[PDB]
Amino acid sequence: HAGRTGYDNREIVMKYIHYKLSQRGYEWDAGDDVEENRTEAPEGTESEVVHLTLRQAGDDFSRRYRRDFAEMSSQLHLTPFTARGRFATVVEELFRDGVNWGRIVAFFEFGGVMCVESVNREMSPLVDNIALWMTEYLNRHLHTWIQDNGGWDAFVELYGPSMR
Ligand SMILES: O=C(NS(=O)(=O)c1ccc(NCCSc2ccccc2)c([N+](=O)[O-])c1)c1ccc(-c2ccc3sc(CCc4ccccc4)nc3c2)cc1
């Protein structure tokens, strides 16, 4: 009794972040389990529509705010110990009062911003860790907000591309 797409907070973040790194050409060792996993074929026209919307959603945002999160990035600093604690401290501010499709878009960007921050130095593997925490906060907050507010289909339906 919950759609038939199987959207996974982990997968969505893994794809979005995976694309961000692709732009640079970094073969992010995401699917460490590279043993040919079919299960039910890669075909996912269902979650495919939102994959583009959500993927493009962040891009359009980053282009609008090119002097907000970029600066705060310097505050994050560079370290594996504080990195994990800094993430939660940042997202916490993303939604002080309440959550909304409008604010969540910034959520994805954050991960990508902090993710690349590690790659810039020499902590590519860390990119995987970030995604782990991202899904936690997204599933522990957003998920509940989206699930109660229609769901994923809402975002894509509300913010749908031209025609299709
Ligand atoms: O305007 C906003 N939302 S909206 O009006 O409801 C909207 C407007 C357009 C679209 N879509 C249009 C097509 S693409 C697009 C998507 C989103 C926004 C703009 C365009 C969408 N949406 O798709 O959900 C939502 C909006 C504006 C500003 C912020 C915002 C501002 C300062 C900060 S600081 C921070 C720390 C986390 C943090 C750290 C690092 C980086 C980011 C955030 N996060 C912030 C987030 C957050 C949301």
Swiss-Prot record:
Suppresses apoptosis in a variety of cell systems including factor-dependent lymphohematopoietic and neural cells. Regulates cell death by controlling the mitochondrial membrane permeability. Appears to function in a feedback loop system with caspases. Inhibits caspase activity either by preventing the release of cytochrome c from the mitochondria and/or by binding to the apoptosis-activating factor (APAF-1). Also acts as an inhibitor of autophagy: interacts with BECN1 and AMBRA1 during non-starvation conditions and inhibits their autophagy function. It comes from Homo sapiens. BH1 and BH2 domains are required for the interaction with BAX and for anti-apoptotic activity. The BH4 motif is required for anti-apoptotic activity and for interaction with RAF1 and EGLN3. GO terms for cellular component: BAD-BCL-2 complex; cytoplasm; cytosol; endoplasmic reticulum; endoplasmic reticulum membrane; membrane; mitochondrial outer membrane; mitochondrion. The lineage of its organism: Eukaryota, Metazoa, Chordata, Craniata, Vertebrata. It is found in: Mitochondrion outer membrane; Nucleus membrane; Endoplasmic reticulum membrane; Cytoplasm. One of its GO terms (molecular function) is protein heterodimerization activity. It is a single-pass membrane protein. Changing W145A: Loss of BAX-binding and of anti-apoptotic activity. No effect on homodimerization. It comes from the Eukaryota. Expressed in a variety of tissues. This is Apoptosis regulator Bcl-2.
